[model samples]
Target: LSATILTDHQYLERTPLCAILKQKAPQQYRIRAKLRSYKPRRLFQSVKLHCPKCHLLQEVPHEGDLDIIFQDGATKTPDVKLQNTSLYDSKIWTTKNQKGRKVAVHFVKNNGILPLSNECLLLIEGGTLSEICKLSNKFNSVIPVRSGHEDLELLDLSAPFLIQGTIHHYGCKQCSSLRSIQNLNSLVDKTSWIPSSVAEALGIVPLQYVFVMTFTLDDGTGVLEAYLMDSDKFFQIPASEVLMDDDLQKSVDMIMDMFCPPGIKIDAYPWLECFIKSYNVTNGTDNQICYQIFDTTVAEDV
Candidate 1:
């Protein structure tokens, strides 16, 4: 009954590495060969949230589109074109075969916006991530600030572009190359709005989930999806409710403080600003980033 000492070489066959032996050696293998055919754990699916105000169910498109136009104050003419890329529409499962618009795209840096009392309006024109980049590049040229107000118009631009219609009051810009890790190199201290590394520390993964919410338009009757908060939660609140109280802003700011890092310090602003200014970075340009308009209409309703 003397105990036998086993060497590393002797135990090598019995170690967990010997997957083959576990199947063949019935007596030698003490643990039953767990023939577990692992079915992949299904990801927690995001429920398609209906617009609480409009009750219109918006199926989160694989890709989204954004359009912005700077109306020439003098001529009352709009520089209507895609923002970042020559192609405007992003591919969606429903519109997979849909061809993108073949038109001359405008870069924001080249074409500056006219100084008008009404700020340039943003529109979710419906397109893919790439198309959004193209459009955002175009849109950002006019608006270079880290954050500002803009009029947002939501409509079914797929066919007939209707004006004065019941277009949902939502603002969207394609999340594009601006958010790429490549672009992160340009972010400086002051202009740095999104704290990715800090977010990572706090456990916020990019593209983890799409946040949705519903709100009422200024008119009080028209209900629309006012804000789409990515990886952020939003409640369906009426315009009356949002305007009546300052709590909404506090909630949003609180979320930002908790989930995101402090605003990129001013020291880091030069590189980030240069990157944005050099590439004509705008709020809409980075599809990886988006903004929620509390109470602005698409300036270019037409």
Candidate 2:
């Protein structure tokens, strides 16, 4: 649902923060509590992939391998009688070969090439996602597979490509009016072949970085958990800028320290005056109450 501001009269109708913990239905309440703990204490949220086509928002599974996070059947099998494979389903992996030359490895199912150890890299070619995961767990450099014998074909650019164990974040070509990865000779010569220009040039709609955290608040009356939506932004910190600016990141860290200091007992934590909203996030068949933070932020550091 959507968030709305509370009136003074409504704010006057407050409830104990711990009491909100007993809620099983959707409703709204105002409370004062101390920030007991909030994770990602690092203060940065995970990256999410948004599809430019269907406008789907995909959460990166975890701090782990990101394979087939987009379409379920996006991978294709090859055409060969004597066939082999190199494949996990990388958006695309461009790495150095035996000669230390740059090459993009595509992971289409049932593709080609024999992988030798120490001197080169390998891509899993023909296996289900379950089977493909076994390789990347050990080798981050593996590109999954497509027929390197022929040419690399761009898959549906509706999702971020996983590279070097990191999930690449950007836009989908289907949703934007731009781009391609084939024969990008200009990047080929460069010492650095980054996707910054490449992903943007291809006209994919880049997903915005956000700060999302799960917080546990205690009012001594009880403890309650809620998301730090903080109006989708609580600390007045620019979500995207935090990644590039060390200062902004430090600012967030400082706020985190101020909110929940280490070595300090929970009873000693500074009290926070906050507004919490409780509502059913789902329909009747699957009813549930959700507590969210909004219109409330850190007022005094002390």
Candidate 3:
């Protein structure tokens, strides 16, 4: 199904700052990111080879150890074999061929390989299906940020500005015989590097909360998203739970002090106030899927 744009009215109510930023400095901030894509194949070819001992035909699977080469090098030798089984009906079977004899088989069907496209990778790695769908509905790749009224709203530019979100399905690729994890990991590692650029530009402070969401598709494919938060609110969450003594609460307070100081506290603007509002992981929606808060346990030191 195609993506459709929703009304922008809902976002304005909560993000006054985003409104100002849109009208003022709409092009100052930027987000460096990537996309992920997938495609599937439907057909495959099979060949049959003759066996001497049993005087029966046998079928050699394309993916099996049976390797058939072509003389011209232009096309592969068709996998043809003498077997008792019929291709149309899985239930019908033929006797197995003798171990040592050469068998002849012909190609029966062909299923093209499905490859991941660069554009698709960027799309999926950007966010959830719904999130990305909203973006695709709103923005056009060819147009500059200034050309579109919608793009201007997403560029967030305020002092102590906060832009926290994640791109789901951002990880290494699957390791199949056709595809190696090493290659997939390299691509994933490179694709996932977009956040590092964001952090550098934003001066990403320590202790910001980053959440990673994970889910698996019906076909067993795994997906993930990494969410980031501003330091002001992110500092309040506990970093880790210590042993049996379990001092998670104390850990939270400690982290808060380290990231969000009383004298040097950082102020956060509502996300809707940023430019390019609906473009990124926020999916142009004003509401926050996650919240940030301050930890109250620190001593009152001026």
Candidate 4:
């Protein structure tokens, strides 16, 4: 049956390149014809289109006429003439109309091809990757470190002051602990003392009730202890509520994570006033310094 099919019908007439079988074929003609369609027919296998703003490259099909769209929404079909033979070289094409303004235009491949835009590339072009990473560091560096009590002189703590720092749970009690000003002695022994003048200024007497939160602030230069007295103004919730409810503690923890993550810069202001005082316990002399907080907002420049 196979032999009859090969000898019988005119099936050979429909097959491409089958006519040379009945005549004397050229040397290697069949081999050359078989590989002809597989050879590289165009100069470049792909063309890289670039985004103007971010300068990112997107490789697209190159083996066709390119459609140039002008800034005025005018479309034109220009001949794609290669100035250089190599695909690695820059591409240049000419348009027939040259009278109008030389405005920016976009290019797309002949049939339904779109080039990438700056938004699609997701990049900003002003700096290298390493330089871009330094932005976070630069942000952190500008934060004024709370050095010894002396540095507090630069601030007026009479009003609210913008403060940025890390939250710390340093009290003797368990998690979600709240302390009243009257039982201040029950707090962590390591906590700093509140200046008498500061307490008097804020109308916080020794036996009065107040919420206390302790955190550390760093201003690239130094570190200082920060206290949040009557923290309701900033946290929006009372200290007793936060201490009694486990869910409230979790929410506060989330806020802490956002405001003060490890090794990252953050901005937060206690929005309250504070003062610093120092005492001399070792020698017969005493030295004291004090400062107040007036602003607690993140710097506009940062």
Candidate 5:
């Protein structure tokens, strides 16, 4: 025997079967009722969906059953309602079930139909998702302010800037190793003199056991260097440990070898929320300006 299921539109108005079920299964009846009552306002509506794994943004349709539209495993819908007026008007809803995860649902204001309470249409949050969202909103807000001005002066130095850069190491290779720690200590004690070339080039006296790596950032318009200090805060592992660990050394070496010449682009945000000093350095006949990086976080790519 086969069973035939009559959907909301299939059942005739005021049908006996619908009336019976409306009385017995009120919850299920309400869902079908809403679905049936909903009418398409437009043929299609564009909606932005964020991926949970990669945190990449994608555009999807707002029409049709969300279950059918988001059935594919590649994309996740965020439980966020973005106001059409502005991106900053986006609001996020929270629930106990959604702990550490964000889900997206399809909503239409004029449909007289609401999202099913139990439905999970999309999962949209990731490690970097919130940061990306915040940055996007902030960037959008800043655009209009800058646009109105004809000639803009220097931007607020205190404001954080998103930077993309490549890492390079400087200074004598032998002195960069652990064996020079004692010599570095003597220099710090003022018993020995710093190399005149090093002093003139860096424009600062070098510290003991502090390895300096240069981060050259390019944002299309220009390039600048930010010095990365090898410290416990940045590396978590001590310089001594880094030298002792073969894997760590190899990883560092690989990055230096592969990304230094022309360099790979990496996204980062300064920790200090401010720009440090900028200075010029000369190499052979080439003279270039470099910035000192107080500190910054290298954002991980999904």
Candidate 6:
């Protein structure tokens, strides 16, 4: 349907994106095109959090992290009842501290009312919603009770408890000893709650960042969709290390800017030389033909 001639080390032909799209049978070709669009402007989706100790992988939610800072900042405490609370819960309990203060810690489990599910929140008897947020931001972990022994502890290992508004990822079953929040208190001056650092302090592995993305490509004659879709690395960057490193994220953005500049029109897109292969994957009933990127990577030039 289209014609172009390009030479490669291997004896094969490069097909236009239009020609590739027209073919129903399995075929392989090298196409030169401009990257039209990429989802996850962040260049990542569904990356996993992995434990260094147990080597277990946990899926990172696409919805991302949440901010639950409900501490009152001004003279008038505004209605935080309107906070994003699809996970609305108000189960409160009371306890007395050694200092003779009545501590009321409210337990709100994942979404709506409580059924003892994963992802929980603790009101922790703090003076204000901000107090808990302050403690959470200061300590790597916070127990519902004060120092040196208490009746309350975190829920199941499978359940990721929210420290105020932050969701802390605990380690795997075999590796983590699950210590008290003492070590969390050890570094009082430290105010960072990054996953890896928190996991480091807690004697467990933190969630590693991995990504999956769909890439759209076009080459004058036609357009096609494929996936950067990798459980590991794509475009030479390791998936497990991107979120922690800004340079890596910026590096990807720069490449995207090069391949598909925002200023460029479809008619003026640059060319990307890459190899693709046709593969069969089941789609409900029949095996659907799908395309994937292969072999080619960013070619460094001076």
Model 6 deviation from native, Cα RMSD in Å: 13.1
Count: clashes, candidate 4: 12
Local accuracy of candidate 1 as per-residue lDDT tens digits, 1-302? 10111211222232221332223322221111111111111111222324333344333332223232211111111233224342122221223345533222222111222223121222333332344444444342111111112311222222111111111112112221122212212323212223343122222222222334322212122211223332331223232123224674344434323222346542221110000000112455552212132212111111
> lDDT by residue for model 5 over 1-302, one digit each (tens)?
10112222322332222332223211121111100111112211111223223333333322232223222321233322233211122234445754543432222121222234121111122213233333333221110011112211111111111110111012221222212111212223132122332222223222222334554443323333344444433333343234324665554444333333233333221211112334566659886544443332222320
Model 2 per-residue lDDT tens digits across residues 1-302: 11123323343656886667676666767776777777774555532344534656555434233345422423444444122233223433223654332222333222232233221233333333443344444543333333433543334444333232323344555565543334233333132324454444344466545556777877778888886543225666655455545777687788778777889777666666667678777646786777777666555432
Error of 6 at 68 (Å): 10
Instruction: Give all candidates' CA lDDT scores.
Output: 0.24, 0.49, 0.21, 0.24, 0.27, 0.51
Output the better candidate (1/4) by TM-score.
4
In model 4, the runs with Cα more than 4 Å from the true position are 1-209, 263-302
By TM-score, the better pick of 2 and 6 is: 2
Q: List the residue pairs that clash in candidate 6.
A: 33-272, 47-210, 49-208, 50-208, 71-130, 87-111
lDDT of 1 at 251: 45
- Judge candidate 2 at residue 134 and give its lDDT: 44
* Count of clashes in candidate 2: 19
lDDT of model 4, residue 112: 26
Writing each residue's lDDT as its tens digit, candidate 6 over 128-241 gives 334555655543344332222331333334433344234444456567665654354343324334455545555654444445556688877888887654434344666655
Show model 3 residue runs off by greater than 4 Å. 1-246, 249-302
Q: Write the per-residue lDDT of candidate 3 for residues 1-302, one digit (tens) a residue.
A: 10111122223332322232333322222111111211111001111222222323233222112111111111211222122122110111123553322212211111121123122111111112233334334321110011112111111111111111211111111210111111222333332234333233323321212211111111112221222222222323322111111354445334333433346412321101111222222436753322111121222221
Best candidate, TM-score-wise? 2
Lowest-sum lDDT 10-residue window in model 4: 30-39
Candidate 2 global lDDT: 0.49
Local lDDT at 173 for model 6: 53
The C-alpha local distance difference test score for the whole of candidate 4 amounts to: 0.24
TM-score for each candidate, following the candidate numbering: 0.21, 0.49, 0.16, 0.22, 0.23, 0.47
Q: Clash pairs of candidate 5?
A: 77-104, 77-122, 78-103, 78-104, 79-103
Q: CA shift at 241, candidate 2, in angstroms?
A: 2.5
